[PDB]
Amino acid sequence: TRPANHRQLTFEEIAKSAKITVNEVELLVMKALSVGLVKGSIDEVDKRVHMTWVQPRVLDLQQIKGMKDRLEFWCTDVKSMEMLVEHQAHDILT
Amino acid sequence: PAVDTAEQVYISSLALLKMLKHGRAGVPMEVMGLMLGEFVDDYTVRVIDVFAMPQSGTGVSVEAVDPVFQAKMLDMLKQTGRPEMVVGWYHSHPGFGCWLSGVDINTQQSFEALSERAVAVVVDPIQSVKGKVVIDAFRLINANMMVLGHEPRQTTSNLGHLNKPSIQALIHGLNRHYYSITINYRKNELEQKMLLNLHKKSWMEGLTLQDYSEHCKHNESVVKEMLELAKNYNKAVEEEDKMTPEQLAIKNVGKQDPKRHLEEHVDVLMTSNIVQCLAAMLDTVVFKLI
Amino acid sequence: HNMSVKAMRFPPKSYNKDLESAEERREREQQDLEFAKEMAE
Amino acid sequence: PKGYMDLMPFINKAGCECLNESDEHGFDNCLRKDTTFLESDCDEQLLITVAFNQPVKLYSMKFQGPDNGQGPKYVKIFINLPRSMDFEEAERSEPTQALELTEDDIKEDGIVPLRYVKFQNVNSVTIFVQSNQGEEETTRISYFTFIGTPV
Amino acid sequence: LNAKVRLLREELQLLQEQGSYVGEVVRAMDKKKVLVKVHPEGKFVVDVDKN
Amino acid sequence: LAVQKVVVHPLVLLSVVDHFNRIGKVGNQKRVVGVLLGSWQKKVLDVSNSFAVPFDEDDKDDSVWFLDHDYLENMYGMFKKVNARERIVGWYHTGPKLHKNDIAINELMKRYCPNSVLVIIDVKPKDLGLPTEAYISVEEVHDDGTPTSKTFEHVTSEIGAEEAEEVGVEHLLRDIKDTTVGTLSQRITNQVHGLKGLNSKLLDIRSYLEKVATGKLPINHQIIYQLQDVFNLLPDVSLQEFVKAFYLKTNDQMVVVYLASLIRSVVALHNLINNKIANRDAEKKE
Amino acid sequence: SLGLGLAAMGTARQDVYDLLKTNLYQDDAVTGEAAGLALGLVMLGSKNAQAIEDMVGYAQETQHEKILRGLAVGIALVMYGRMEEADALIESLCRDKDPILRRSGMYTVAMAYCGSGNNKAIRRLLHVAVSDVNDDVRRAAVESLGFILFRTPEQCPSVVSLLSESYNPHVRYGAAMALGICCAGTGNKEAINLLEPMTNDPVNYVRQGALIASALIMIQQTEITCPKVNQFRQLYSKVINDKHDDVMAKFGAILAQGILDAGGHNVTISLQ
Amino acid sequence: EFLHAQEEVKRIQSIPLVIGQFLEAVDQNTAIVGSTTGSNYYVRILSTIDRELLKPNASVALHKHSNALV
Amino acid sequence: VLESTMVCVDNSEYMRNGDFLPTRLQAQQDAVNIVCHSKTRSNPENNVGLITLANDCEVLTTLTPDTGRILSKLHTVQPKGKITFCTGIRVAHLALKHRQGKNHKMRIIAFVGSPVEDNEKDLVKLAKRLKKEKVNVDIINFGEEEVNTEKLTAFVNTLNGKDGTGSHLVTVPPGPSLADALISSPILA
Ligand SMILES: [Zn+2]
């Protein structure tokens, strides 16, 4: 659910969403990390879990449409620098 | 009806590569094959395609043409859109120039009896380098006509005397028992663009960043190399001041030139770091999370 | 580097004169003619 | 058209044989305009031969077909063929021109060029429709004629 | 640059010209004759180039 | 898999182009199919020769198709006699994309070479990509419970040339190949081509997702699984740690560039010194 | 065909054109070369599209090179002295993949710009001379410079002087021919000074072109008019009587004697 | 064309090549080499040869015909 | 005559039946051995090839001036699958278009021993396509002629048109051997 920029789950959020004790949050992440459901790390001092990867899941058409919209911005950025390098290095381009 | 000196033999891009590949693989056997094509006119001989005859056994020389291999290869090539007659034969001369030996002259006479305009193409895969292939097309000079005082061919143009005969070929019977036909190459846009894909790096390699650990170590090592070269470069400047112009170059033989190596290290390092920096900067926005 | 390279002057020497001389280039042709006219025979 | 003209009067209309013709629509429709069309029955392929007097020069043809996809796409043109021509001798032979029609050429307001150098003295013309603009098992031709001059 | 290219193509023909023997002069003679000793091939009486 | 890389030589490309041209001359052909010959080195294929075989397919039905396998055996004995080290390593076809009956043709090809590699050689001169796309037949065991099927798995392709084959290619490309461009300019052109190639790949995915959104094709659930990994792998270049590391690494290369440029300028000054000395000495004696 | 075209130069008669076009369409190498060349001669300067369309269209369809060589000269002659009216054809020919058709564009540039000194036409010729895939087009590109600068003969020995020392012998040959064509009859000492070392060129045909060009430059010229006439007059005799000289260098020397004493010392070459 | 000329001069290095010994550099383009045939020759040096490798007693490949240092 | 023929042998499940002694698979093998041998002596240049008519058609041997290789392939043919006559003729017609010598005449030999499960319209249009390429398909309606006698009737009538006996529809009733009726059939005449 959370974006890749804000994938630092605190121990309270995992405890509240999973109806588990805060002390049991840590063991829960081990099972997810060991099995392979999620990739990431645990920061026990700060009580935060740094997830970096999740198992891909089945997505609805609307979610796919949002995914395609993300490619629209990605394609624009790649095209923008393709013209930028072409324009700037036109004389030395082979 | 004397043949014209302005006659040209046109070898396709596919034909040239086949003889080069077959000739090199058969080094030093004089591996032979048949050239398929069409006698367009009295002045043009097109070689659309060639195929290689098998070597019957050991021996660095041209063997007899195998008729069963030739006939049933020609029959089976006609099925896949190649109804082209045999316009001559090709064979390899691995490194000793392009000419015809005594055995080659006899082999050509077999083709001359069937087709009077048969062409003997000799390819040197060993002496051929990038951008210049050592090739030549030969046709025999009849002894009866030349002995009585007749030129083998008429010269109505300048085209056939643009290439100066090699001394190796002139030694081995050129312009005495056989003559050379100028070879032109037929290249189209389609095949030429297709060959441009050779060594064309993948798009992944262009954006791929070199390992930063090895890049820094290479940065480290080469800069350390200039530390010694610069120290030697200073000595080279003072030495050449008090040193005679006859030894401007003789004294440079057998001793490394710090200036030359410094330029190479600078040139190597400038492209290594600029490409790595630009690739890193391009990947920063192209691959962005936002 | 660009300023220094642009400041390099080549004197207007008689170019293509350090190539093969016309008389000496003829020397090989006469000698090589006898090479083909004798070794081959 | 610029000093040349349409040449159906030269076409004898008696030595014209359109193989793979359909009983529903015959070869007469595409040579007279006035709507209607020619179509094939057995297969998408459609072989057409046209005969006329020996002195005739071809500059262009206007093989306008329909728009649904039944209009010809790849056509083979042969000239002065002794003996009859079956569908194989129109498919396994080298045509004088093998122009691959685009949708713009099929448009009734469209004229396709031919290599005029190779069409100078024509005894008869063999036309081999090999494919249409699609996968329609029958190939249709709304109109067709040769624009040129007698030799 | 043209001279560099022209010299490069002419070098290929030049490099195919046969190399020169290395000999030792015993004594000079009349009519520009010199007695030399080619390294493996004994003694010779040779001409002298006009230069 | 059994193949790590397929190397297609320029002779094969010219043979395939010629094969498509000569048969395409007599009759309009959707594609032409031949047999690829080559050797095996470790796990990289070395496709080096090819010959044409009779082939025809009805466009309406993918099931109807004929390949002259007796011709295939007869022509192999020809090439084996001339070159015994070139064995059947797969087949080729000039169709711009894959065909539904390709998995069927591969089975006929598989009996001569068990690990047959299909290389699609596009005769049309594509501007960005390589003309060759190598595929191998594998058993895709699905996790949805659907029965295992035979699918083509892509194998990376590269055009490489033998020493003598390269010699002929440079002869044919002598005029048009411009080697005057320096190494630094060549790498930047590679980066521009990398940007163009990545952009084209991204548009292909966007085009696929656009059709999926409108219902033109259904959800594959393997591409969507792959796509989530692609966007998850997109690094965050706005992190303080990465920015500081990027700045630290960029400055490390800049000083080396600065040192090399510093050495270049004085070496250039040395050359100018020699030029002026040579010019002054030449005019003094004249 | 050669006689008919030579007798119908510029007459643009349809009957001659129709007969010659029939011979060209016969696809004969020997006949087509003369028919193609005569086709341009008969329709010399007519610039009509039909002659251009027939000849250029035929040149892209015939498979015989001898026909192309005749057509290349013929196409150029149709648009002779047409100034910028040949611009459309020139870009079409110079952009062609056929080497001979590209050679026709260089010839078309020469005839559309005979003595006009058009630096735009000179700009195109010099570009092709130094940058072209085919040596024949390069040789013809330099050759066409003579037809554009013959009205200002002093201008040729400056533009073409550096091309006279190029690596490519074909450009060097054209450099000789450009001086011969442009400085024909003028006895230009600057042009003759360029040809004098070229008569000792390592490549045989470059020597032939220089010898022929020298004859064109100083035809009828005397010792007082041109100091180097006697030196070259003995040079022609030396080449002919040199048994060890290449035959085509002698071909130029024998021709050079013919041009030098042409018309019984009573004719000159002058494009103006 | 300079690159083409550099590329095309490498055919002088085509095998077979007789092996010599570098003895003395007379000038830039000429040197004295001792061929393994037992004869000392005064031959030319290919311009694309790294003269920093022409150390004394260095084995050099010579043209089988002209004995030139290639 | 100088013609190239392809035998569309059938190996469907119905070939295990003993309606023809000893087995329909064995009976048709003798049928091929005689019809293929007949085409050899009619012209030594005649071409004969094998195409199987299983669930998916499989060209066992292309056209060849050899007889023995045809039977060795037929030895390994086992009963399996259902007849697919629609695709069998086209895959056999495709090989006919790629024969050794284009001067040979089209000819296809079909061994229909299982019912053709197609509409009459598709069978009719197949005949019109073969008539376009002057292809003559010779069919023996053995096996299930009680239900194929009408579908194949439209096949040959449309191919033969109104004139010329290009193709034959000889139908052998079950008995001792269908090959014994082949030598009297116009196929071998
Ligand atoms: Zn030989």
Account of the protein in words:
This is part of a larger assembly, with nine protein chains of nine kinds. By secondary structure, chain B is α/β, with parallel strands linked by helices. Chain B is 42% helix and 20% strand. Chain B has helices at 13-25, 67-77, 102-114, 143-147, 167-171, 189-195, 203-207, 212-241, 247-250, 258-286; strands spanning 8-12, 32-38, 44-52, 85-92, 119-129, 132-140, 178-186. In chain B, helix 8 packs antiparallel against helix 10 (258-286). Chain B is extended. Helix content of chain E is 27%, strand content 35%. Chain E has one helix and four strands; from the N terminus they run H-E-E-E-E. The longest helix of chain E has 14 residues, at 2-15. In chain E, a hairpin with a 3-residue loop joins strand 3 and strand 4 (42-46). Chain E is an alpha+beta fold and 51 residues long. Chain E has one helix at residues 2-15; strands spanning 20-21, 23-28, 34-38, 42-46. Chain G contains 15 helices and no strands. The longest helix of chain G has 15 residues, at 135-149. Chain I has 189 residues and is of the alpha/beta class. The longest helix of chain I is centred in the first third of the chain and has 19 residues, at 24-42. Chain I has helices spanning 24-42, 68-75, 85-97, 120-132, 145-148, 151-160, and strands at 3-9, 47-52, 58-64, 105-112, 137-141. Chain I has a five-stranded mixed sheet with strand order 3-2-1-4-5, sandwiched between helices. The chains are: A alpha+beta (94), B alpha/beta (290), C mainly alpha (41), D mainly beta (151), E alpha+beta (51), F alpha/beta (286), G mainly alpha (272), H mainly beta (70), I alpha/beta (189). Chains B and F meet through helix 1, helix 2, strand 5, helix 6 and helix 7 of B and helix 1, strand 3, helix 2, helix 4 and helix 5 of F. Bound molecules: zinc ion (ZN).
Chain-wise SSE layout:
The structure is cut from a larger assembly and holds nine protein chains of nine kinds.
Chain A: E1 8-10, H1 11-18, H2 22-35, E2 38-43, E3 48-54, H3 61-88
Antiparallel strand pairs in A: 1-3, 2-3
Helix pairs in contact in A: 1-2
Chain D: E1 5-6, E2 38-39, E3 46-51, E4 57-61, E5 72-79, H1 87-91, H2 103-106, E6 112-113, E7 124-132, E8 140-141, E9 146-149
Antiparallel strand pairs in D: 1-9, 2-8, 3-7, 4-6, 4-9, 5-7
Chain F: E1 5-8, H1 10-26, E2 33-41, E3 44-52, E4 55-57, E5 65-67, H2 69-82, E6 87-93, H3 102-110, E7 117-121, E8 132-140, E9 149-155, E10 157-159, H4 163-172, H5 183-213, H6 223-232, H7 240-285
Bound molecules: zinc ion.
